[PDB]
Design a protein around this ligand. Sequence first.
Ligand SMILES: O=S([O-])[O-]
Ligand SMILES: O=S([O-])[O-]
Ligand SMILES: [Co+2]
Ligand SMILES: [Co+2]
Ligand SMILES: [Co+2]
Ligand SMILES: [Co+2]
Lengths: 352, 353
Amino acid sequence: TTKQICFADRCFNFAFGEHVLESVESYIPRDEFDQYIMISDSGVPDSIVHYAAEYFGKLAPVHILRFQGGEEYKTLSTVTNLQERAIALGANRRTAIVAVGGGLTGNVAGVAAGMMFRGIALIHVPTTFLAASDSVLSIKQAVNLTSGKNLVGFYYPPRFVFADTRILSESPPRQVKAGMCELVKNMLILENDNKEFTEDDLNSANVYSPKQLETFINFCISAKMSVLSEDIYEKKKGLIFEYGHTIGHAIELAEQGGITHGEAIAVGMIYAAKIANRMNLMPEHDVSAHYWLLNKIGALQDIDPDSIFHYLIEDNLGMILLSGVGKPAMYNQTLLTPVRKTLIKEVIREGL
Amino acid sequence: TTKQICFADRCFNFAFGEHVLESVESYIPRDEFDQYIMISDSGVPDSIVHYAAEYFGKLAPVHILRFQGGEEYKTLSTVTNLQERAIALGANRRTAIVAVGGGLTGNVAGVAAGMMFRGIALIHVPTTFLAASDSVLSIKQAVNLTSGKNLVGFYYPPRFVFADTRILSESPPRQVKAGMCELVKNMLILKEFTEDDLNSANVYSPKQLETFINFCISAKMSVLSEDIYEKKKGLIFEYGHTIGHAIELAEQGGITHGEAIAVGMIYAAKIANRMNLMPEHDVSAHYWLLNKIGALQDIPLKSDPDSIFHYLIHEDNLGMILLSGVGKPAMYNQTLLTPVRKTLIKEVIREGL
Ligand SMILES: O=S([O-])[O-]
Ligand SMILES: O=S([O-])[O-]
Ligand SMILES: [Co+2]
Ligand SMILES: [Co+2]
Ligand SMILES: [Co+2]
Ligand SMILES: [Co+2]
């Protein structure tokens, strides 16, 4: 399948299906770029990197640049190093950066492509379900600073995106689950009575066929772009995709790598549902709907309050809340509702 | 004086006059920012930095951050270090970055502000005539790689610009001249003053500089308001820069950017005339205007033509921005880039001036 993705006036074609790379020659004219710099962090399977290089090499010369994976290396220093090497290889304004890997690779290659000559073509080849169904449907780019995660970056759109569903269907279950957590998030914050799948199609083992993931990806494209096509910087209505992230982010940090971003956001939504309830916004029934749906994908399986609350850090803190399933709660014509710090800490204390 | 400058829908106020900072409060609202992080490379006079910190401090807490000046330090590494220090001082989205200095500081602070939290406020306080009348009238930001200058960067507009003309009128004549060369360029490619107000000593009153600044704003923005990336009609501001930049590099710092561009313009005019595109009377106009600001007087040209050729090309044609006459750009294939035989370029570089 191929969908046109537009962020304001900047669009790109997103192809996703089995062996999509075996057809890059049908989406990209051979005269478009004169070279491809393939960037992939070490945590990415070589077989995939070499597989992708073989097909892009049919359009023009390909040069593979690998770098040390890990959140500790996602820095401007790594970007600079990749840029220096890209230039030594003869990179120019006709060269295209091909990011093959997950979210970490996407961000590093994204910042690199956005700064070279003040901006060259970025091509995403997502190897994880989270990157293919969520991060690739966002033009935010960023790397870390010694003092914080993703504190430096900017907005930069890609020119092409290719997601191989065969590769995705063979990625580990837990990694697939992290993306499914964000999909359930889309189901909770948006109203949609016309999906190509039901909750009966969700499984806790998180093992799907190529076609089943294709359907999931198609659903996320429709969900996010129905909003982000206009709110390109995700500062208005786009803030809705931040559901579960306020406390989720803090929990993710507190666990120090023990849980995925998806699992953290899942617990974050539940805590957000309870909070909305304690504040007279959301009926208890909708709270249960959060547990029910998340258990269907086994989000709460592989899962200190003071620690969590510390990372989180006036008596109030803004949160994206819902009055009910598919119904975001507004405040001053904004999606940010001020919430009592003492209430947030109490809910975190009660737990799941 | 205050002028509203707009690159497409991104606008900012540019105030300039004597002690414009001493009245910053009437230019910026009290609750606009909760903190000001002053960035200034080491080559900038301490008196100016502390002077600017005193007045911005009347609006909110001010922290001064310095860094090693010099082209060697205009890198992403230097930017990263400034970003870490700003964070350690509690920088946030309500914080404003104040760049006090010339082009070097402008670019370093610019890249820093543009990336923090994916973009925070950038305020320029140009300390050189060249920065105040030309570089801050461009939203290009960039730093260098070990393999090339300005290879990494992006486009990022400021929120406010303040040019204290008292400070500018006390800056060194050779510094003033470099910006004056760009002002002459503007006069040739496209005012409240005449050629009579130009002097070769390059010493001017705050008032005269205010008039020059107004002219440059009006001239550049008449084109850049729409060509924000300077990739089309905006290429006209590269006049004299094709060979000029090669010469500047070849001289390794012996000559200022302005001086290099002045020589580059003389060469472009001769080339335009030799290609039957520009009358001799127009060529002479170039020497006349440039001699009034004493741009061709000194010029310690030491490098050899081969070195200049090398930095210039590292095919029998190179593209140049040429004129058919004073104020009349030469168009080619609906572009401002006219193909020029290497033959003519090497000849003019070899003969000098
Ligand atoms: O975590 S969101 O619900 O503010
Ligand atoms: O240097 S400009 O005249 O091409
Ligand atoms: Co997320
Ligand atoms: Co400077
Ligand atoms: Co210049
Ligand atoms: Co230009």
